Design a binder for this molecule. Sequence first.
Ligand SMILES: [Zn+2]
Ligand SMILES: [Zn+2]
Ligand SMILES: [Zn+2]
Ligand SMILES: [Zn+2]
Lengths: 297, 154, 445, 645
Amino acid sequence: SFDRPEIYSAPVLQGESPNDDDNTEIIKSFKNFILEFRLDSQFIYRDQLRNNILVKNYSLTVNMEHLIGYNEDIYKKLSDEPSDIIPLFETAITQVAKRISILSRSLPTFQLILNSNANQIPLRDLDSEHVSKIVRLSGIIISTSVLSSRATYLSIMCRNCRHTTSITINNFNSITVSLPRSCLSTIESESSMANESNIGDESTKKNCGPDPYIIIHESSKFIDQQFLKLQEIPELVPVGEMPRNLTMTCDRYLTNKVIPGTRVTIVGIYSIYNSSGVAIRTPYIKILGIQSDVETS
Amino acid sequence: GDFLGQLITVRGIITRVSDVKPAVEVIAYTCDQCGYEVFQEVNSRTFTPLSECTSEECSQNQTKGQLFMSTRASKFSAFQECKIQELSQQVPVGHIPRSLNIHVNGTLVRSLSPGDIVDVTGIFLPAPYTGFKALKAGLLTETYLEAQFVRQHK
Amino acid sequence: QTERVFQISFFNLPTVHRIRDIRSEKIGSLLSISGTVTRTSEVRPELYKASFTCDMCRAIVDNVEQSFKYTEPTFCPNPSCENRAFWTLNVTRSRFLDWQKVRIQENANEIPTGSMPRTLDVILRGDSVERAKPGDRCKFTGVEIVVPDVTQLGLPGVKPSSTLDTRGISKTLGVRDLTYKISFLACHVISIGEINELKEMVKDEHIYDKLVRSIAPAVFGHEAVKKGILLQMLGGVHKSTVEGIKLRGDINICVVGDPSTSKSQFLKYVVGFAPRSVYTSGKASSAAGLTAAVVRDEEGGDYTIEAGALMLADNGICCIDEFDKMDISDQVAIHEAMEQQTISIAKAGIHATLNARTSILAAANPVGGRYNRKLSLRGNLNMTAPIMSRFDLFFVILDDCNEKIDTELASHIVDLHMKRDEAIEPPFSAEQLRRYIKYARTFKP
Amino acid sequence: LRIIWGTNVSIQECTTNFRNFLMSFKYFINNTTDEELYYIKQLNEMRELGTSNLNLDARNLLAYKQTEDLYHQLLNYPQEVISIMDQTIKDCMVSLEIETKFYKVRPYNVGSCKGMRELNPNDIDKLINLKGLVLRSTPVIPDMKVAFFKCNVCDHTMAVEIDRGVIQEPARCERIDCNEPNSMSLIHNRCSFADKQVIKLQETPDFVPDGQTPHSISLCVYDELVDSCRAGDRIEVTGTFRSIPIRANSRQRVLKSLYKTYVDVVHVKKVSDKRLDVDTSTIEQELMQNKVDHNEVEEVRQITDQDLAKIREVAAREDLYSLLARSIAPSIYELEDVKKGILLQLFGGTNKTFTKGGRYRGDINILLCGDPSTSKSQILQYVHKITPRGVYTSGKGSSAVGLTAYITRDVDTKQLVLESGALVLSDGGVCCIDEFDKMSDSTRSVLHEVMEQQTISIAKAGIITTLNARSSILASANPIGSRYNPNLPVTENIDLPPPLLSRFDLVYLVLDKVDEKNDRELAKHLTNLYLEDVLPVEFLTMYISYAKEHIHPIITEAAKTELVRAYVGMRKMGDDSRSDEKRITATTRQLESMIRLAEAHAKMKLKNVVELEDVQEAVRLIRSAIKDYATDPKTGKIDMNLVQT
Ligand SMILES: [Zn+2]
Ligand SMILES: [Zn+2]
Ligand SMILES: [Zn+2]
Ligand SMILES: [Zn+2]
């Protein structure tokens, strides 16, 4: 009738010398950038982060061309493999804000909103090249769906044995984590009396069932997700053809920022999802920034 | 069973004493990629060694180093196991004397020898069942005694 | 029409290595070793080049090299199928070889001080099978190999282990144990250890006396025992009647004396001279070590018999010292070997009849230390009546006190110590005498 | 002062600290070798001889002021200190092939400690020394160092190095053209291996706490120290203290929390100043193998020329025979005739080998009959402790299986192995049987062959072979009833068949008489010991080993005449008293006994010639042992008025 053993660590020695394309070095270079980069004599991003934390907006808006004059390597990587770098750049901001809150007196992952002023590919100039890459687009909004609920933290329980665990999601861009198919009590032979409670009932093996996990909703947390459609400017369209449109997805601090009838600049990732032909996929854009030309007052 | 988890003293005679061997409590590992040190806790009679690194750096980077055991850093204890039997004047009329198990750790080893009459202070604690499966009904457990202070009558 | 398997055989190397000198820096090289053979197995087929069928597609892959293990193909040859793990075996169209296993032991003269003999497993292939008999001294030329060994899990020390390198694999567990023991695979097997002289011997008309005077030269006198031993080395005739009654043709001798008499030197002479002879003592021998024992093969599916003293002396002489310290259980087996020439085995569900056509040389101590001249022979011995009846000759050695004989005996004993081996000058040598005995046994009077 | 993590060692500090000591060492002191630069002779002679191992005593360093620190550090971190000590050598050697040859050190004087079972878990990875008797050793085991991989799609061969036991198998072929996943195969016989052997040792500590039964220890010897130890050997071993976790069973990768213990041997010592040197006549081929294997384990001891000069200076002494007999047991007030037999037993007869097969050995066998309450028991103990190989047996405590051989189950490998017995472990030594008369006829049976041919023949399940038992027998027997009765014959006083009594070379009748000046001397002798010339132990053992090693005596005709005359005279006596077992009848073994004793007496005093004096002394001793100078040849009775002390 014993307890759960633990695993813990502590730094001792210098390991192998660090390769510059290491993830930790990327996080450290981006944390240096945040608190170092200067324009004129004001440290813009530290001040911005402090002010945003005062008003409970957990986000940072970064102008993309400010980094192509500080560290071009991490710029090339971001424009080439955005899905791998964005999660890493989202750790440094949380780490900095953690210190700021503690010294200026439950913080979720911080959202990175990208705003840019550069080349703009038209909506009809999209091909196989731009897949898993960052593009800049202009157009008009015609649709905005209703906000949907998606999980970030899930607490679950097994309906047969009563084993409990948790799940954390920090990747909401796909439109995926799922609930475990088998009870995790058997693979985590953790306690000395637990593997003994797993037996009995004459001669047989504890079988919980095909999918036995129930979600305890009062102990879970959620976020908002939206769908939008962008249309090409109805003026520079081929004569006698229907205008083409694209489907875009956004969440957290980008929702309810626009209304249909607005002309906008969007920065995002060109990706696909599965929905006649041997192997065909449907494209869509993950939103990373919104800028409106001018709004109808 | 009323006496489990308490501090109790016993009176008996020692029948067998085992040698002194090391018992592992925390195992130490060294990663060449990061230079951290991983410490694994053991409280069973059998355990499974770790394979991959669980450091923060290795946990983040895709490249994860391989673990090796460092004997010197580990946590070790001195272990002995003793059997104690009833005195003749305590056995009921017509029955045979019974036995019990005692555990010793630390600087209290090499203090009991076979053939001694003693009074042992210990903590009465349970252990997992080790009998036949077909004869198991419920959550049955075994008992052992954790030595803390030894008195000898001679 | 298949191709013929070819085998190469090297021999006549410069040096021969002892079993207790094999090291691990000679692994996979050519060497020659010596030893004594105890156990052999039956001949069984071995997988050499196999044919496999694909389970995704049905293609045929032929002539896969096995190399000491059950190897499977690692890539479908069709540029389309991507099968690498799923295969089935056509046992009808695969090529086999012949396979036997032999067990060897260290020779008596090569054992160090205070230690026990060592063993080694020898593998034979092809045409080399069935050349080694139990109880032989052979020289092997071959290659020193390593085979898996799961008995080492428990020995102290660091035992090497294998794992796959995870540095370089793109991601978004097969540990194997390297424990081996040293074995031997052989390509050449040899068993080690003119008419002018034979026709010269046959003529001499004092040949009998010379032969008598050439036996056990180190012993002084006792000519009757010398004659008996020769007649026992030569033999009689084996006959069979119409009714299947078998008439026996082996001579059995017993020498009776007290611990003072020189009766063990006769036995030691015969165990050093005769081709197939074994020396055993009363209280250092068990029944299983005389008749036979049954052991099971690791390969599985069969069993093997291991020979005892009586089987290793088939068509030969078995020497037993201290016959009076034998048990009734052993004596009932010796009687079976003497009336019948068979040994019966029934243990663990194995039935087997084995051949023991052997002669018995036995030395017995009087019942009370000394021989009582006032009692009969039966009163002085401790044997079962069935055993005593089937002995042909009983020789009793008694002591006499005569001065001239004592002078001669003492002179002889001191001469041997002073002059080493230049104190015998026998009529014939051992190599001469073996040839004559071999020639003599082929006559049927 | 860089400190290696987890230690207090600075590599540069210790290397520089070590090279000054190695280039300058100091120390009833001489002026020839005790005041010269010591270790540069040791290195120069090493490189000259073509040798690779330096043997480094330890207490050398606990005096020289600098390297005191290094002694404590060597007894605590053997792994890190011994790699510093080698780089000093191969640097020091060229400072004086030597650019491609590897050097080693071997500490052999670590002291203190009080046995394996007194060591705690805090003594893991420490240097300790052990003494004991070897029983078993497993055959050589191959250990992998470099592995061989073949690409089955491109035939590119790769080699890998073991790193602390683990092998890294490449996932992708290394060829830039053939880059396949999982194409690497292992070919076992193309790999590089090394040697490993496991020994089992019966520990013989000095302090035995109350109620410790003997136990056994496991030792791992690698590379050079293979076949350097044989069962029956009493050795001294230096090594490290380790621990290892074991797997619960073959199928599962699960381990057991309680650890297993053993010792990594670094140095082995097979000599002692206070014991005799092994018989080279029995290990001829091991000496040849050691040179072929280049292991510098020294079996025999070194003799300087001052000490060898002392040897002949003493060997010239007039009273050598009395002096040697006196210094055998310097604390047993007893007749010199009894001690002379032990002295000549130690020298042993000349071993002779015929070139047509046929071996004659020179082992002496002695029986000590006589009243109880004598010092027979001490003689056997003293001889047990001076001879290199021996076992002590009781009468009614032995079995034939326990004396010859047996099969046992090894708790490590769980298989059945063969193990040696009492008499085979005593090969080239002395076996002491106490209370011989109380032993069964079944157990007495096995001794006949050992006393006749010095072999044993075993036909049991698994073994059919002949074993070598070249041992000396020293036996003591108790007389029937209270005391020896002079009125009865000897054959009626000892419960042993008269035919068996004739197999012994010497039979000693130890009789007790009441006489006032003998009693006075014995009482003063004993009382002098409870208060607060002779040859010390070292010199005695050295002399005996020298004689047993070099000289070899051969007999002459003048001796032959006397031998034959003596044998005939002995047989002619009592020719009428043979039917009645009054006296011990004479046989040919007595002739051989005279031969053996003459050769042993010749070997003493360092001759190669057995002259007439030797045979006369041998016959004198044989008669004096049986007390034939006081026996009535008709009745077999002893006149005690004539038995003088
Ligand atoms: Zn469950
Ligand atoms: Zn790591
Ligand atoms: Zn296929
Ligand atoms: Zn390849």
